[PDB]
Write a protein that binds this ligand. Structure first.
Ligand code: 1GP
Ligand code: 1GP
Lengths: 215, 219
């Protein structure tokens, strides 16, 4: 599934037993995102028909359908915007297949999550701020994805609505604290693509139910 | 349609240029005139340029006035500071985003390679780069950020044509701009061999007759 525009629901993985992985991959979810050990999980996912993406956070493992490359737009440090990216392309640029690679314009909005701390993300943003990042991602930078990252916490659907209004061709991903079908549905009204991570490990039945709720 | 630009002149709105020179400049056959302090001064120069049909772009390096055909927005790719990569841009779009026509806006992925120029000092640009570094920046602009323009900035000095050659090899859909130290037709011709678009600035004020001759050398 290299056509990311059709994704409505995706699951994101970080141990996970075969039974849960099997149910996950056969759930009707549009993709499974992995965010030597990686190869093993990939091979296990390949037993199924679901598209498998690798979200690249370090300076590239073969076998995936899509490679998602975060750019932390609201990071106060150039290394999470261009630095690691430059280092990676300098080292591996000759052998990269860019047709398989999709940039994600991240806006990290949960101060308590590890990514926010690692990247020094300015999370204290009003809706005007986020809308401005969304415009930069589409109209200055030309990224296929703008990603609202609330990882660990559930955000405000009315904010997600405002961001979607500001976007046109750039796809809006939302992720963070979706644990019930109702939470999934509400974000999915506005976000193009809803991402469910943590609930997989803590409340599997409900995490699974988010697929049908998004439809 | 910036894709057809082969030669462009860049004017400093803070430096004076009399009407006769401005006329000869605008009717020289250049593909565009780029204005690169105050809004009163930018508009006044725009009003004067509008006497002619040459496309006029504004290069926004600080917070900006409507009326231009194209807005060229530098992003300093080789800056060590987030402010010159996205920060200042965010502040500007936050205030003026509602009134921007995105069809008129083109980001320029700048790679500043002259350590002695004012921009390199202000933006804290790492100019100490080998050709691989520069190519990687070009590739990022082409494939990751998908910016309309990649800009090799040598402002004040004439760069090396073999460098812009290799960078051009890495680009496809992103347009390659070159600017820096172009005074002679030979300098203009040689960069135009590899760069999609050649930018002539300082020579306008320091060597006007020579600046005008660069047009034909490219086109
Ligand atoms: O873990 P959760 O909160 O579901 O977040 C999903 C995804 O955005 C995490 O990167
Ligand atoms: O002043 P010169 O060296 O012509 O440079 C042209 C332009 O690239 C300046 O930003």
């Amino acid at each position: 599934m290299e056509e990311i525009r059709a994704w409505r629901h995706v699951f994101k993985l970080d141990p996970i037993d075969d039974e849960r992985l099997e149910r996950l991959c056969e759930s009707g979810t549009d993709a499974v995102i992995v965010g030597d050990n990686v190869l093993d999980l990939l091979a296990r996912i390949r037993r199924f028909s679901v598209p498998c993406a690798l979200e690249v956070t370090d300076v590239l493992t073969p076998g995936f359908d899509v490679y998602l490359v975060p750019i932390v737009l609201n990071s106060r440090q150039a290394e999470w915007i261009i630095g690691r990216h430059h280092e990676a392309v300098k080292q591996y640029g000759d052998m990269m297949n860019w047709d398989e690679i999709a940039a994600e314009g991240y806006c990290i909005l949960n101060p308590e999550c590890k990514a926010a701390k690692l990247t020094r993300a300015d999370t204290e943003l009003d809706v005007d701020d986020i809308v401005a990042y969304a415009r930069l991602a589409e109209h200055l930078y030309k990224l296929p994805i703008f990603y609202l990252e609330y990882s660990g916490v559930y955000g405000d659907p009315s904010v997600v609505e405002k961001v979607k209004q500001a976007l046109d061709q750039t796809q809006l991903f939302y992720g963070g604290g979706i644990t019930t079908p109702e939470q999934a549905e509400h974000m999915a009204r506005y976000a193009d693509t809803v991402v469910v991570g943590n609930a997989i490990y803590d409340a599997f039945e409900q995490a699974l139910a988010t697929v049908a709720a998004v439809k």
